[PDB]
Amino acid sequence: HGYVASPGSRAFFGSSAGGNLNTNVGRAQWEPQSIEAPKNTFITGKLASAGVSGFEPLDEQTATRWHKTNITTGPLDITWNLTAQHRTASWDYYITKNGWNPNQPLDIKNFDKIASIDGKQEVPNKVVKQTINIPTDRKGYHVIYAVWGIGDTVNAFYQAIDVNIQ
Ligand SMILES: [Cu+2]
């Protein structure tokens, strides 16, 4: 169990630690760390919730529904906080393509992978800091999809992150 704290994930922003910058987020208000589903679950319109019961409100998609963190292109520091550390296989990051439609359901086919970090089947610290590159053809509102792949289960944790690139 874990979430991306910086830039705050959509779920994290629903919690008091995240400033309640997103409202009406279901279970994310209290447990943004709990978006767990089998690896390679990418159901269109169910990316933000990973299809998990109680997280459905996260799946709404409009240009103005969610709080964005202002960022630039180039290097971006990602910080995870893990409430329950687990042996780790992988960390993968995706971002919406230039030209994507922010008023349509999220579809992984409209994202590119932009980073992949091997967990080496070790147990990470409770705070995990990584640096990824935001491609320079992205401007404005984009969604980063951060995926923590567990090493000793068939599951992963899924974190949609709303950013405004300028
Ligand atoms: Cu866990």
Side-chain angles (χ1 to χ4, degrees):
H1 290 56
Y3 49 86
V4 174
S6 175
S9 76
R10 187 182 296 177
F12 178 70
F13 281 150
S15 75
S16 57
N20 297 285
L21 296 182
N22 290 332
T23 81
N24 293 270
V25 295
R27 286 175 62 196
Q29 184 175 9
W30 311 116
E31 49 175 327
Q33 64 263 36
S34 303
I35 307 184
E36 181 183 3
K39 290 185 182 67
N40 301 134
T41 302
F42 296 108
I43 301 176
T44 293
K46 307 252 187 293
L47 299 194
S49 72
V52 178
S53 71
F55 285 105
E56 306 85 353
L58 290 176
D59 293 317
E60 183 172 10
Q61 190 55 56
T62 75
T64 63
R65 179 63 177 92
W66 307 116
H67 184 87
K68 292 98 185 155
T69 300
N70 292 149
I71 71 166
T72 56
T73 58
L76 175 66
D77 285 349
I78 307 293
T79 304
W80 287 80
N81 293 347
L82 317 182
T83 65
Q85 293 154 278
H86 304 304
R87 197 162 171 185
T88 298
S90 56
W91 309 85
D92 294 297
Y93 297 85
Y94 308 81
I95 195 171
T96 43
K97 299 170 187 179
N98 181 51
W100 83 290
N101 186 332
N103 201 36
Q104 288 300 307
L106 297 175
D107 183 341
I108 199 66
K109 287 179 178 78
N110 299 328
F111 290 70
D112 294 320
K113 195 169 201 188
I114 58 164
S116 186
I117 305 171
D118 191 342
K120 303 171 74 190
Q121 290 283 1
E122 295 174 15
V123 183
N125 305 135
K126 271 173 285 279
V127 172
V128 175
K129 303 178 194 200
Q130 298 170 338
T131 301
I132 68 173
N133 282 313
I134 304 305
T136 54
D137 59 348
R138 267 65 168 200
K139 183 177 195 308
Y141 177 29
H142 283 277
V143 174
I144 301 169
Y145 203 47
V147 184
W148 173 31
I150 306 306
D152 52 7
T153 76
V154 296
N155 296 341
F157 292 79
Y158 296 87
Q159 292 281 288
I161 305 162
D162 297 292
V163 298
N164 178 234
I165 305 171
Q166 307 297 342

Short mmCIF file of all heavy atoms in Angstrom, two decimals, residues 1 84 86 157, ligand 1:
data_model
loop_
_atom_site.label_atom_id
_atom_site.label_comp_id
_atom_site.label_asym_id
_atom_site.label_seq_id
_atom_site.Cartn_x
_atom_site.Cartn_y
_atom_site.Cartn_z
N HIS A 1 0.83 -1.24 0.00
CA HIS A 1 0.00 0.00 0.00
C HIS A 1 0.83 1.24 0.00
O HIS A 1 1.73 1.41 0.82
CB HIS A 1 -0.97 -0.01 1.17
CG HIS A 1 -2.07 -1.02 1.02
ND1 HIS A 1 -1.83 -2.35 0.83
CD2 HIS A 1 -3.45 -0.87 1.02
CE1 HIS A 1 -3.01 -2.99 0.71
NE2 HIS A 1 -4.00 -2.09 0.86
N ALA A 84 2.47 0.50 3.73
CA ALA A 84 2.85 -0.91 3.91
C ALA A 84 3.87 -1.23 2.84
O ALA A 84 3.52 -1.34 1.66
CB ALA A 84 1.63 -1.83 3.79
N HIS A 86 6.29 -3.32 0.54
CA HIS A 86 6.26 -4.66 -0.04
C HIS A 86 7.43 -4.85 -0.97
O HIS A 86 7.86 -3.91 -1.64
CB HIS A 86 4.99 -4.90 -0.86
CG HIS A 86 3.70 -4.68 -0.11
ND1 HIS A 86 3.39 -5.32 1.05
CD2 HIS A 86 2.60 -3.90 -0.43
CE1 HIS A 86 2.16 -4.95 1.44
NE2 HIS A 86 1.67 -4.08 0.55
N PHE A 157 -0.07 -1.23 -7.52
CA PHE A 157 -0.78 -0.03 -7.06
C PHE A 157 -0.74 1.04 -8.14
O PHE A 157 0.30 1.28 -8.75
CB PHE A 157 -0.21 0.47 -5.72
CG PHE A 157 -0.49 -0.49 -4.59
CD1 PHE A 157 0.28 -1.63 -4.41
CD2 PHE A 157 -1.58 -0.28 -3.75
CE1 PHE A 157 0.00 -2.53 -3.39
CE2 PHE A 157 -1.88 -1.19 -2.74
CZ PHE A 157 -1.09 -2.31 -2.55
CU CU B 1 -0.02 -3.11 0.64
#
